[PDB]
Design a protein around this nucleic acid. Structure first.
Lengths: 142, 129, 150
RNA sequence: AUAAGGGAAGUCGGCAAAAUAGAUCCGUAACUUCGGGAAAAGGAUUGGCUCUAAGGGUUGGGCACGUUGCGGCGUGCGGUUAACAACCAACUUAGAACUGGUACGGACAGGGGGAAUCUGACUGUCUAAUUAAAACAUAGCAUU
RNA sequence: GCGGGUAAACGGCGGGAGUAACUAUGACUCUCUUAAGGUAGCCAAAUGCCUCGUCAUCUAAUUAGUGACGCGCAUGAAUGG
RNA sequence: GUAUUGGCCAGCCGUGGUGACAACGGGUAACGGAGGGUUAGGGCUCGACCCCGGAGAAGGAGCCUGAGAAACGGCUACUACA
RNA sequence: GGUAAUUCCAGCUCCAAUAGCGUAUAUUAAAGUUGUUGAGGUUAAAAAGCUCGUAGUUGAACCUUGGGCCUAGCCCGCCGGUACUGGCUGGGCUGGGCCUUUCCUUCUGGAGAACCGCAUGCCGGUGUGUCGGGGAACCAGGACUUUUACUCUGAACAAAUUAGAUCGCUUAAAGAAGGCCUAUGCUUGAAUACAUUAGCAUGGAAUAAUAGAAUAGGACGUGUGGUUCUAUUUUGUUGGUUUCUAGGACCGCCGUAAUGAUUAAUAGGGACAGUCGGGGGCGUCAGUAUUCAAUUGUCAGAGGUGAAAUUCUUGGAUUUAUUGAAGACUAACAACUGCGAAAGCAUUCGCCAAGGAUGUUUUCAUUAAUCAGGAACGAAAGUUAGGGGAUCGAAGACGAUCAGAUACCGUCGUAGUCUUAACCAUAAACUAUGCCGAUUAGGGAUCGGACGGCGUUUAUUUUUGACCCGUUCGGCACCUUACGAUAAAUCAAAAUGUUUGGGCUCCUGGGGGAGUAUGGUCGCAAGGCUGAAACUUAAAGAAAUUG
RNA sequence: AAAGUUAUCCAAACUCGGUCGUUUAGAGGAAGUAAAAGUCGUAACAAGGUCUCCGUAGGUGAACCUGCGGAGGGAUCAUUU
């Protein structure tokens, strides 16, 4: 209650909606284009990078395990990120300087599960595909 | 200050009917109020009404007989075409069989059903069922 | 309620339904008009011209007896005041506050009242200009306002 | 007083010398006690000759009577020349053409500038004959 | 002589040991000690002996210059900061 | 002067024009439209791309012929490549 | 998931879609979590400290209604007859004509009807004819008509696309094709609606604005005078001149007429009368108390605490009576009471200007509501210069307590506490509840004004004042109830909201980072106003129930 | 009538200076978030053992303490001549 209701008050109603629309969080990040600027990916879906070293990451408080992440430097703009290697015993397939391909966890810029500070996962290594190697459908080229 | 005498009359009638009385008094009287009551009277929703004449504006005493659920007013008098008249009856009428939407046109104020017969349109001012 | 207040009083006067003089008046309309002009020349404003007639002898409503209002009657006889009386009294009160204010510099409450009174004068003067009672160039100058009252 | 090429490599130290300089028009930062800094920094023009335009002063104003050696006053009026005519007089400012061995504040006269530190607030004063300064004085503040 | 007041009066304003799941440091604690134990600030400064102190900047090369650090031989509040 | 109007340009003379009903300036991962996707109604979002209009031929300027070009599968000059 | 894993790695079995299924990013629905339709603001996120006011939005009622006849076009019911047809004094719907004081502008021309007679001819009607009294309607041309918004119907405007009609491409997404006996032939289709803002015409005349006669500068007349301009053809032709006549502009005299002004809002402003209040400013008067000082009498302790100590004392402390000075403050009366825009305001008297309510057969006539920017006031502490400095007491110094005590307790004590002239602009500035207007239920108390009444009291006494009973207008509040509202606590508003629209301004969108960084602006300073992002997280929070 | 030549106009390009925008190195200083067997106290929730909170000013290893003016979201809806 308290809106202008007259027949010639179309200017105030249109102006008010424009100003208060910024209080929304989903719309505010769309208008300013933060993804184009701050996100390591240039607003894209995938990216290619070079593996630097293998790192183990501890799980959060209730759990206890080693998550076995990896360090990657992006070819497109030279930034450095960390990515998670899914499935059981798959670090064995990746070596140093292996040209991996990455994607997201699907939480749209937030960490998934108990893994802290990790936002990406490895999809392909040496252009073969990680899951295909796991089921012994293909052999990794030398 | 008083900006819509029509709303005051319709609101006062609605309160008295909901509490079960039989008669109502309306302090200011105008042509639109009287022309509105006549449409309601011809459908049996009220009985006789009489307008006592003081020299300022006069008053009205209406006689109720039940049968009335609600009577409201739309404050911004929108402009409605003939083709879009079916949008409104879907909004503020309980059912298609009965109920009336009051319009004002160049041929006097009238309900939404005879206006279709005469093929006329205008402005919307209220409703009752 | 009130223009500048929070009160909501309803004190007023009730006009009788009848529009005809009482049978005991026995006074012609021409005599009343001549009676009005004599008092106006003595100095009375239209405000208390009516109350003298009502209280002292006879006429209760000048309009019913003669068909015209007091201010309309005076104008046709060349006796209308130069400025309307309602605006004249507002000017007179504003002058008296300024004279008192300069002697009592830090009376902060009376300073608040003066802003209200002057704000009421500007609103009322604008209405008179747009109807033609006052010339379009009329302005309320605080420096020379003291001459208008007296 | 002048010097090819280099331009402080000299020296405790740019000591001495050189460079800038008038007027008209553009442009001008940090900081600040909002007064300053400021001529900040940094650019353009300048002769001769033949022309054009602008900036002023003085005296004249139509009828109708009376005085007077073509006229000076007394007046009685009317009109505001859609501002005309004659004469007189110095300088200051702006613009155009042509011209030259591209020169012109042609001698004289005539500021080098910028980024920072230490120290006294400023103007002022003293060891005449080796020391002019951070020294003395000052307004302001406090005590007896 | 005995007893009070006064620092914009003259002037003054400290040492030794332990101690935090890698070293290091010491918020914390015991101890001697008197008129009080240098507070806010500031610094290799015209005030620092060791000293051409350590780090950065300026240069091909700087005992010089500037910005930081401070147990300061021997900075410091109208002897004014 | 131009195919013609026009402060389009040259002289002389006035002091104006836009703005809280948002001027001026900055952003656009901006060619505009017919239209695509998603739906109770009201809406939100996309449109380089077969149709219509505008602009460009590595970056800028200049010009010849001709009814029609400031053309680049036409010419001249500079800058960058070769 | 920590030794019998329905959740990992495997073997069986089963479920979902199926020539397809999974994953990442963008976008829509779900979202009434962006809310014009349609969203919260007492306590969960959120009403500016308060008032004035410009843009902007919004604004009370009133001017030709009704009635009486005729007639048409479309439906239904009924009757009867053969899907058809007629009728109902059929009842309805839409429309067109007349009289009621109203009806419908006007001139020229065109062609020509109806109603009329004229004579000529058939079985009381008719072509009669360049016959005339005569133009219903129609067409073309000229003049007059307050102006916008709104709606209805037309015109003009692109193909494709969307909706949609037709035809068995073997069905279908498509396509615009096809069909008939057999034909040296015939025949058809390639519709229609929508866009929608702006622009051009036509009918309607409710709703919402606007204009007109008040210093008459007003309307009308073949009434009657003037002075100015223009000049068609007629007197052969041209030029010059005049009269009459026709038109326009302007100004007099006379006549005609019902000669021209809507209410006075339980809207608003102003005036008047008797009052009321701890509202504001300046001056002045009074009260005890605390501290200090002087005089006076006596003699050993006084202070303070749960208990002690520091401190003061025969240089007479503490206590007792009289007198003096200084600064601050107004006890009891004092309350579910009063005034002010809020902050706030309490001893007496004098002066100065202001305000609410009530009363009224005064006056003006829409002058009004809320407000982006803008402006006035704004406790306490704090800041700049003077005056004052009794009491309390930030900082500071000591005594105890305690393992420690930079505190709570005790003795001292600086700025400050008060006032004049200028700054500052923030509070749990709270009713955590914005402003105007309407309606909705019972009750008893109370403050201010008016009106009515039976008595008591009382005075140089009546009328007035005090007390009692009842009605009414305006306030600060309270009790019961729930037809209502909410998650609940609870509420006469927090009600009249899924059956949702009386007007207007401001603010909020999960929790942190954060009222922080940076830029701007105001200030002497302390600081005020405006106000992000990176990053991080699955819960914070409100009301009530059992332990 | 070709080469050549005089004076305007349209003007690419380079040099120097000013100004605006984006990205990025830096001794040292001061914050935020998370993690972990850390050290020192016990400020808040009961009258949390000095009732809690708001504006302002000062002080202290740290939570915090004290002065002045407010609020009840309190531990009181209440005391008579």
């Amino acid at each position: 209650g308290g809106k202008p209701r007259g027949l010639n008050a179309a200017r105030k109603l249109r102006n008010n909606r424009r100003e208060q629309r910024w209080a929304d969080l989903q719309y505010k990040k769309r208008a300013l284009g933060t993804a184009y600027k701050s996100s390591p990916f240039g607003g894209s879906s995938h990216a290619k990078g070079i593996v630097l070293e293998k790192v183990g990451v501890e799980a959060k408080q209730p759990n206890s395990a080693i998550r076995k992440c990896v360090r990657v430097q992006l070819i497109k703009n030279g930034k450095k990120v960390t990515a998670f290697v899914p499935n059981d015993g798959c670090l064995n397939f990746v070596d140093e300087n292996d040209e991996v391909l990455l994607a997201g966890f699907g939480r749209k810029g937030k960490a998934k599960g108990d893994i802290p500070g990790v936002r990406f996962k490895v999809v392909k290594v040496s252009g073969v595909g990680l899951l295909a190697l796991w089921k012994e459908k293909k052999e990794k080229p030398r | 200050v008083r900006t819509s005498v029509l709303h005051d009359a319709l609101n006062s009638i609605n309160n008295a009917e909901k509490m079960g009385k039989r008669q109502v008094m309306i302090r200011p009287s105008s042509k639109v109020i009287v022309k509105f009551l006549q449409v309601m009277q011809r459908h049996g929703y009220i009985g006789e009404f009489e307008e006592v004449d003081n020299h300022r504006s006069g008053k009205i005493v209406v006689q109720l007989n039940g049968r009335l659920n609600k009577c409201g007013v739309i404050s911004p008098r929108y402009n409605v075409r003939l083709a879009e008249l079916e949008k409104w009856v879907t909004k503020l009428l309980p059912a298609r069989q009965f109920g009336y939407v009051i319009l004002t046109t160049s041929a006097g104020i009238m309900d939404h059903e005879e206006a279709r017969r005469k093929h006329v349109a205008g402005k919307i001012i209220g409703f009752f069922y | 309620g009130r223009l500048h207040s929070k009160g909501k009083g309803i004190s007023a006067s009730a006009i009788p339904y009848s529009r005809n003089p009482p049978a005991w008046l026995k006074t012609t309309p021409e005599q009343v008009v001549e009676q009005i002009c004599k008092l106006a020349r003595k100095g009375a404003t239209p405000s208390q011209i009516g109350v003298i007639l009502r209280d002292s002898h006879g006429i209760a409503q000048v309009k019913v007896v003669t068909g015209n209002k007091i201010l309309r009657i005076l104008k046709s006889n060349g006796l209308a005041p130069d400025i309307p009386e309602d605006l004249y009294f507002l000017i007179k009160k504003a002058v008296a506050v300024r004279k008192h204010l300069e002697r009592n510099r830090k009376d902060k409450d009376s300073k608040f009242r003066l802003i209200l009174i002057e704000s009421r004068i500007h609103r009322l003067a604008r209405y008179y200009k747009t109807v033609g009672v006052l010339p379009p160039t009329w302005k309320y100058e605080s420096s020379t306002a003291s001459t208008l009252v007296a």
